[model samples]
Target: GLVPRGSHMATCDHFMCLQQGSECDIWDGQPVCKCKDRCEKEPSFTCASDGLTYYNRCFMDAEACSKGITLSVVTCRY
Candidate 1:
C-alpha cells in the first residue's frame, strides 16, 4: 500500500522540462536517481474515529453549518 522509498519516480510536466532544455532529455526529462539518496518518503496522515491528522501539503480546512449545527470540513481526506 506504500510506495517504497529509494524508488525512481517521474513527472511529465512539459513546463518543468522545458525550463531545463537539453539536459532534460538526458535524464528522461525528469530527475535522476541512485537509490541511495534519490527517493524521499511521503508522510502518512491518519483520520481516525477520534480525530484527524494530516502530514502533507494540499489540505483545506473550512467551517460549515448544517441543520443549525456547525461542523468542521476538511478537504483531501486521504
Candidate 2:
C-alpha cells in the first residue's frame, strides 16, 4: 500500500519516498512523491556531493532516490 494523502503531516522527509525509489516533488497544493525515470530537460544544472553534475535539482534528487543514497548538494560547478 502507498502512503495516503495528508499523511506525514505534509512533510516530504517523513513521507519515506526514498524507500520506494521516489522523492518528494513540490506541487501547487501538496507535495507529491514520484519515482522518476525521466526529468524535464532544463539548463539549470546541479552539483551534488556525489561529485557529479545533474540536469537539474530534480534530476539529482531522482538519482539519489534511484541509488538509495541521501545525496546533498555542494557548490555548483561551472
Candidate 3:
C-alpha cells in the first residue's frame, strides 16, 4: 500500500493516520483521523502507476489513501 506523508497530529498519537498520510483532529471530544488538507511544499515531481503526475510522493500517497487505491512510483510518461 502507498504510505501517506506530511506532518500529522502528535498529541493524539494517531499512528494509523500518520502512516496513511492523513491527520488527526479533535471532534466530538475525541481524536478523529481524516485526510490531510495540506502537504509539504518541497517538490519531488513523482509519477505514479495511476498515470498521474504528482508534485511529490507525499501527494500521491495521500491520493491513494483518499481514493482507497494503491499507487507506486513509476517512470514519468514524459
Candidate 4:
C-alpha cells in the first residue's frame, strides 16, 4: 500500500493503495526497501523521519516519501 502526499484530493481515509511496478496508487498516493542507497557513492548518511537511516537526503526523498513516510530536510550522523 501507499500514502499520497500532495494532490488535488483533500480526503483522508483509513486505508492505502497497492504498489504496482514503479508506480504506486495515492493517503491522498505515491514506494522501496533495500540498501540500494547506502554504503557507496555517499560518504555520508541521513536519518529518515521514520528513524531509519539512508545514505543521504536523496534516498530519503525517493524511498521514504513514496511509502508515505514523512521526510526531513537535513542530515544526521550515524
Find the candidate with the highest lDDT and give its number: 3
**Candidate 2 global TM-score:** 0.53
lDDT digits (tens) for residues 1-78 of candidate 1: 588788755653442322211123225545532112121246544232225543422120111111222223245453
Candidate 4 Cα errors over 4 Å, as ranges: 1-40, 73-78
Q: Cα miss at 49, model 4 (Å)?
A: 1.8
Whole-model lDDT per candidate: 0.31, 0.72, 0.76, 0.49
Q: Is candidate 2 or candidate 3 better by lDDT?
A: 3
In order of appearance, the predictions have TM-scores of 0.15, 0.53, 0.59, 0.37
For model 2, the stretches where C-alpha displacement exceeds 4 angstroms are: 1-34
Off by over 4 Å in 1: 1-15, 18-23, 27-38, 42-74
List, residue by residue over 1-78, the lDDT tens digit for candidate 3.
Answer: 455586343356543464456777777657777877477979999988988989998898889879867788998854
TM-score, candidate number 3: 0.59
Who is ahead in TM-score, 1 or 2?
A: 2
RMSD values, in order shown: 17.1, 8.9, 11.5, 12.2
* Models ranked on TM-score: 3, 2, 4, 1
| 9: Cα error in model 1, Å | 26
lDDT-better candidate, 2 vs 4: 2
Q: In candidate 4, list every pair of residues with a backbone clash.
A: 3-27, 4-27, 4-29, 26-29
Error of 2 at 59 (Å): 0.8
Model 3 vs truth, CA RMSD: 11.5
Candidate 2, overall lDDT?
A: 0.72
Clashing pairs in 1: none
Clashes of each: 0, 0, 1, 4
